[PDB]
Design a binder for this molecule. Structure first.
Ligand SMILES: Nc1nc2c(ncn2[C@@H]2O[C@H](COP(=O)(O)OP(=O)(O)O)[C@@H](O)[C@H]2O)c(=O)[nH]1
Ligand SMILES: [Mg+2]
Ligand SMILES: [Mg+2]
Ligand SMILES: [Mg+2]
Ligand SMILES: [Mg+2]
Ligand SMILES: [Mg+2]
Ligand SMILES: [Mg+2]
Ligand SMILES: [Mg+2]
Ligand SMILES: [Mg+2]
Length: 140
RNA sequence: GGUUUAGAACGUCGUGAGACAGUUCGGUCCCUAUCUGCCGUGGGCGCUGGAGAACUGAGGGGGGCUGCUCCUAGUACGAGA
């Protein structure tokens, strides 16, 4: 009945400053987990997370988009864990979306630009995740 | 085509012939280039015995325009846009 065991579930968010690479990382995650047959790119509007017309045209994520992927590993090490990822908007003008998601999620991948690193909205999502007391990993 | 000839009519002015930075219809645009100039093209002589070819380069002319798409690069800049 249960397609995957309880232990093999990973509810995570991808949170960061604007244009830190959240949607691109989500697209590569979907590609390497096989659900997406083309990598696409955000600035051409081919990103799957940026499904709304405004997101496609303006190159930004305005909504928290939740999807699910199956990951075994680089070397197929593990039985397929199911990662429930949510791509959140790093805009300070959409903070309720990230707070909304981050309440329910169990982990956060905080993305940081290698050049800019910690930025204002990275600090904002940091505070939100801290008040929700969630575990974090970081992706530079 | 307009502008200003000769015809005709409207409005207005005048008694009238006629007239109007008023309008309307119709109304003949000539020249075989001597010289200069210019574009090409040769004949004569010269360049120091004659001739055939290859050049040199003074000097002169020609040409010089620019959009859009992509990469750099969603890069620099920008809280973002
Ligand atoms: N050069 C480069 N561009 C990236 C990288 N990650 C994302 N981008 C581009 O940077 C822009 C913003 O990244 P995006 O994935 O949309 O991030 P988000 O807006 O923070 O969710 C897009 O044009 C991406 O294609 C990266 O690691 N290197
Ligand atoms: Mg994005
Ligand atoms: Mg952008
Ligand atoms: Mg006559
Ligand atoms: Mg008359
Ligand atoms: Mg010259
Ligand atoms: Mg010249
Ligand atoms: Mg581009
Ligand atoms: Mg704008």
């Amino acid at each position: 009945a249960r397609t995957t065991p309880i232990a093999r579930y990973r509810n995570i968010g991808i949170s960061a400053h604007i244009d830190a690479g959240k949607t691109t990382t989500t697209e590569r995650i979907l590609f390497y987990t096989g659900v997406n047959h083309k990598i696409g790119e955000v600035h051409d509007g081919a990103a799957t997370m940026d499904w709304m017309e405004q997101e496609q045209e303006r190159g930004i994520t305005i909504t928290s988009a939740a999807t699910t992927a199956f990951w075994s590993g680089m070397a197929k090490q593990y039985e397929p864990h199911r990662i429930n990822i949510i791509d959140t908007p790093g805009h300070v003008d959409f903070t309720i979306e990230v707070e909304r998601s981050m309440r329910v999620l169990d982990g956060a991948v905080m993305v940081y630009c290698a050049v800019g690193g910690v930025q204002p909205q990275s600090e904002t999502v940091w505070r939100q995740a801290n008040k929700y007391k969630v575990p974090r990993i970081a992706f530079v």
